[PDB]
């Protein structure tokens, strides 16, 4: 079974540079050639470049060539793209694919899982977990919506949960944005009315890369 | 080089329905067309090459045609594994070049968004900080805009907006916006408004709140 494993994720800085892998398995290594995708969240997929493993020869996309170096390891099966002067612009998704030919014409028929690189100077840093209460001058209704502002934490993943899982439904864990070098995210529950403030409502986020655990709960607000 | 286009970038459909995909060529580029299918978890998987040719174990109801400048993705039939994302790719000339995608999404009912709006918590504010914190929850289709008020006109300096993906048991979307300020900007003004304009309705949802009333 054809297969491309791509090494993990990847946190730099900008400026620096990076060098990401894609090991082959499966098939004749230098049969194939290897082509690199890049994927960023709002313009769908460029083509870096591809090598040819057999001979080493390399065919790059003009605006990747500056920055981009392609190479491989025909002992191990595993091709390798470099990335130099790195900039906020190259935090991306990162593909490899193998190419078949047919007709003249080349076609990715199997592709890596992908590596994720994020260019920051930012280190492991724990959330700052924000209770959301609704206003004091608020008049809620049957249904009160509480939230959790998980603010200033690098780097991704982190988990949310209610009352340690035992609030499942009305539950909205938010994907995470970009503030300065940092993440932050929201996650709402709703809940009747007679469940809160008569009962505790806490959220508990898990921050792994920082081994953090904070459990944070929603109290009404004081007036004045 | 060679810019590829797909006119729709979002597509609504039911299970079953007969959904076709389309992709635009800037030149000619003489079949040289293929199609990738990329699910939510990032994982991407090739559909079909040369225009019509169907790679091995693709089921039969992914069909591609097309000639010259413009082509399509045709999926009978439409399953639930089928939802994700659709790109078309020319080999024709170099650089290779994809279209922007098609993300399928599934077919509902009308929903006009629950919003709610939140000031600054008291952990925050002590730290020196203020958000103002808004979600839009349970509504469909998925375009909606929200728009911030300070003092009744309109902010958008350290507005951050995030997207749930389609939910997939009752197929709503739900949005968050979060207004950041410092501690000292936020307590110079009073009222801070969260509207959401959504074809619900022609009048926006508003939600706010005043500081002189906390």
């Known amino acids: 079974e054809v297969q491309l494993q791509q090494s993990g994720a990847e946190l730099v800085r900008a400026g620096s540079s990076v060098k990401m892998s894609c090991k082959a398995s499966g098939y004749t290594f230098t049969s194939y050639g290897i082509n690199w995708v890049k994927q960023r969240p709002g313009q769908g997929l460029e083509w870096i470049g591809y090598i040819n493993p057999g001979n080493g020869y390399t065919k790059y996309n003009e605006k990747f060539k500056g920055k981009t170096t392609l190479t491989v390891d025909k002992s191990s099966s595993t091709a390798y793209m470099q990335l130099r002067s790195l900039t906020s612009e190259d935090s991306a998704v990162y593909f490899c694919?193998?190419?078949?030919?047919?007709?003249?014409?080349?076609?990715?028929?199997?592709w890596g899982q992908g590596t994720t690189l994020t260019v920051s100077s930012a280190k492991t840093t724990p959330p700052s977990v924000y209770p959301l209460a609704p206003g004091s001058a608020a008049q809620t209704n049957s249904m009160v919506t509480l939230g959790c502002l998980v603010k200033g934490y690098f780097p991704e993943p982190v988990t949310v949960t209610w009352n340690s899982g035992s609030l499942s439904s009305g539950v909205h864990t938010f994907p995470a944005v970009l503030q300065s070098d940092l993440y932050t995210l929201s996650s709402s529950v709703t809940v009747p009315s007679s469940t809160w403030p008569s009962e505790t409502v806490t959220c508990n986020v898990a921050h792994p890369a920082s081994s953090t655990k904070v459990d944070k709960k929603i109290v009404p607000r004081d007036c004045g | 080089d060679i810019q590829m286009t797909q006119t729709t970038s979002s597509l609504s459909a039911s299970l079953g329905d007969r959904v076709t995909i389309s992709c635009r060529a800037s030149?000619?580029?003489?079949?040289?067309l293929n199609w990738y299918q990329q699910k939510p978890d990032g994982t991407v998987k090739l559909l079909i090459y040369?225009?019509?040719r169907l790679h091995s174990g693709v089921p039969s109801r992914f069909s591609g045609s097309g000639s010259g400048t413009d082509y399509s993705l045709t999926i009978s039939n439409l399953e639930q594994e089928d939802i994700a994302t659709y790109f078309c790719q020319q080999g024709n000339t170099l650089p290779r070049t994809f279209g922007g995608g098609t993300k399928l999404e599934i077919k509902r009912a009308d929903a006009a968004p629950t919003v709610s709006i939140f000031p600054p918590s008291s952990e925050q504010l002590t730290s020196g900080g203020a958000s103002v914190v808004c979600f839009l929850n349970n509504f469909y289709p998925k375009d909606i805009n929200v728009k911030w008020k300070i003092d009744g006109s309109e902010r958008q300096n350290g507005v951050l907006n995030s997207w749930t993906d389609q939910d997939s048991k009752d197929s709503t979307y739900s949005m968050s916006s979060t207004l950041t300020l410092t501690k000292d900007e936020y307590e110079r003004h009073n009222s801070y408004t969260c509207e959401a304009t959504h074809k619900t309705s022609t009048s926006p949802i508003v939600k706010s709140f005043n500081r002189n009333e906390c």
């Open positions: 040369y225009t019509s």
């Open positions: 694919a193998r190419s078949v030919y047919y007709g003249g014409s080349y076609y990715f028929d199997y």
């Open positions: 030149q000619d580029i003489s079949n040289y």
